[PDB]
Amino acid sequence: YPITESNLRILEGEDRSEKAKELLKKYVSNVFENEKTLYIYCKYVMLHYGKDLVNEVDSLEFQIINGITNILIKVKDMSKQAKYLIRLYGPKTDEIINREREKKISCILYNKNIAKKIYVFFTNGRIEEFMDGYALSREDIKNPKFQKLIAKNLKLLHDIKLNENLYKELQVTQKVPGTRPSFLWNTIWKYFHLLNEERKKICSFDAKANILKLIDFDVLRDSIVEVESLCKRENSPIVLCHCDLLSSNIINTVGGDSISFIDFEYSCPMERAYDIANHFNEYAGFNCDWDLTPSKEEEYHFIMHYLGTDDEELINQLIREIQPFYICSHINWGLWSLLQGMHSSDFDFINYGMTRLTASCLPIFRSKV
Amino acid sequence: YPITESNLRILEGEDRSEKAKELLKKYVSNVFENEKTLYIYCKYVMLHYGKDLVNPNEVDSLEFQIINGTNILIKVKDMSKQAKYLIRLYGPTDEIINREREKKISCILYNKNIAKKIYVFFTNGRIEEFMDGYALSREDIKNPKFQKLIAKNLKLLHDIKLNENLYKELQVTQKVPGTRPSFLWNTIWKYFHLLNEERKKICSFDAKANILKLIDFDVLRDSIVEVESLCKRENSPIVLCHCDLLSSNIINTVGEGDSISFIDFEYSCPMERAYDIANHFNEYAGFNCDWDLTPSKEEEYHFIMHYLGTDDEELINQLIREIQPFYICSHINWGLWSLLQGMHSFDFINYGMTRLTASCLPIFRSKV
């Protein structure tokens, strides 16, 4: 399973840079024996990949900092007093994430000033610009003070124009056919098909896939078709969405509150109403306390500062638009979580997946439509 | 709609005892406008139903306190003889609790020192023993100190000898056929078909039943079949079980010395003994369903050692082996029950789905 300290050992007389190079290429799983083995792997990331960023200095301070499918490592320098960030990907690198599409989106966002700079890309992680600040709690995102600041930044993201050439570049990496289309339904159906082809296998009595068999996939197929239709009838403008706007993805950098978003691994063109309703689901947190999701009044306060207008006809009209995407967000993250639970490496994916899927059938969410 | 203070008014010159008997039949919904009206009604309960517990002449000396720990629980104090009682008023409660079975088991247990006493059963409630002790938490039931006392009180319940005459009068209450049969599979299948029947009905887009449609019921059926078979292979002796041994049904009355007792026998019936134990072990997790709090092989051993009352390793290991498939059986039972409660009445739907999920989880399936 894990990478060992002796796996990463460089012996006397060996060329340290040549050896760090081939050790980085040999051990790409990002599963580590301990914190010390991680930091050694990190020293080699900085030595080879981040060579034009720091070679003489191995006086770098490494600190493991807090997503769920990534490992984040803060790199400090004494002599230059400059901070970098190492992001090491999990074993869920293609099934759920398209790295080539994530790479294209990343530079668009940086050029439009909503993502920080990524310095180096490698097959198992990256080196990116450190940003100071603290991650928000689900009670922060619900707080009208941050609702205002989140909505304004979310409009800035949603204002990014999507022209024919970059749209084609994104279509070819993921396999989306159509003119200026949403990436949402392609993604939801992708999860469905990967789970249904897994549900088809006959497995042992105690296999991870046994939870899938309890779900009626024909009724699920019908339900996704039903949601797709109800969501498409709202005609929500396809914008560049964040797609994972949970509270821990929203950073308050004080210096007066200032809000920015991180972790754009799911970012792609979708209905703007998906990104808002998905964000509103996240008021519940991972614990899924659904009574924390916004009232009509709370949806209003966010959307007012999202649109930049006190015009209630325009506000109320976007209120209506987001309403069936609540269920859409449940199905999306239900199937994602179940897929992760099949190939599991420290989160209760199955239960979280089933709870989201349960939420998609619940009256409190179905009566919104 | 709510029972009012004016609804229960007894006029000067009318016999209080007869007027209260009439008012207790007429008003059974247990929904009252205020606490005051609740207590006036509690006074008539104690007058008419509780005349063998509290003297009818001493009903104006009774004190009442609503206990915040679905039904109304009311503390009753006879200030005259300094004696406490608990009135339980059933809430507007689901029709899959057999009160008549519950009455019968209550009589078998009245003097056995295993359970609390229930004095009178009436149609919308009962008068039961007041417990000076406290209900345990999920951390208490895991504590080996309480494991000892619970297992021993469980054994005493399990060893209650049930005549063929008392067995058959229990069998007719729940319509379970055969001789010396387990009520367990009859109950599970009743839940399944009641839910499968709701599932087939034409349903509005936002009705409670839509969660049942996402559940594959043919696979749910093959799973109940597969689990029934695995449990029946263990040949677990059928005994009087409690069936719902969560931590709050276990009460510690100090006297110094811990003294453990069981309450709330709504689900109690003859079942495989290994169900009662594995069901109790699942409740180590609490309503939060934190499955990593369920007992390891060593914690299962320590409880079973005190349940059997022997240090004999082979006898212990045998019961550890016996109880294994009943973990999954406990999940399905309570999964199906919670979903049923969720159809017409606490988040029942989510709890039901968390239990049914648990029935499919490797950590439970790998035990078998």
From TrEMBL, chain A:
InterPro entries: Kinase-like_dom_sf (IPR011009). One of its GO terms (biological process) is phosphatidylethanolamine biosynthetic process. GO terms for cellular component: cytoplasm. It comes from Plasmodium vivax (strain Salvador I). The keyword Ribosomal protein does not apply. It is an enzyme of class 2 (transferase). PANTHER family: CHOLINE/ETHANOALAMINE KINASE, ETHANOLAMINE KINASE. It comes from the Eukaryota. This is ethanolamine kinase. Transmembrane segments: none annotated. Belongs to the choline/ethanolamine kinase family.
Automatic annotation (TrEMBL), chain B:
GO terms for molecular function: ethanolamine kinase activity. Gene3D superfamilies: 3.90.1200.10, Phosphorylase Kinase, domain 1 (3.30.200.20). Pathway: Phospholipid metabolism; phosphatidylethanolamine biosynthesis; phosphatidylethanolamine from ethanolamine: step 1/3. Signal peptide: none annotated. One of its GO terms (biological process) is phosphatidylethanolamine biosynthetic process. InterPro entries: Kinase-like_dom_sf (IPR011009). Keywords: Kinase, Transferase. GO terms for cellular component: cytoplasm. Belongs to the choline/ethanolamine kinase family. This is ethanolamine kinase. It comes from Plasmodium vivax (strain Salvador I). The lineage of its organism: Eukaryota, Sar, Alveolata, Apicomplexa, Aconoidasida.
